[PDB]
Amino acid sequence: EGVFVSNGTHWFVTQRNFYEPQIITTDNTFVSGNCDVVIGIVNNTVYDPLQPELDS
């Protein structure tokens, strides 16, 4: 829910009706297919919330 935006250096997801920028993660995004199909897709890291736990 919401949309991807950039301040010119970083990419955030944010809700459609009130700017509240959030880190892009596997929790706030869903996957479908590879890069090749989509018009205007861009490259960024998507954070994984499990990795601090796998550090234990």
């Binding site: 949309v3 459609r16 869903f30 297919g33 199909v37 018009i39 205007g40």
Partner: protein
């Protein structure tokens, strides 16, 4: 508020319970069905009053 048209159409698909990726994975087909459907309007109105 400006927004790209293929992003407006993803919000519009998301409003009928169809997941956004359906648009982006089919944007060529959806654009051609739309442009073709607009073409039939002129043929219909030109064919009969």
């Amino acid at each position: 508020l400006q927004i790209p048209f293929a992003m407006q159409m993803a919000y519009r698909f998301n409003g009928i319970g169809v997941t956004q990726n359906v648009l982006y994975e089919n944007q060529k087909l959806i654009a051609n069905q739309f442009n073709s459907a607009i073409g039939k309007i002129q043929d219909s109105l030109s064919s009969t009053a």
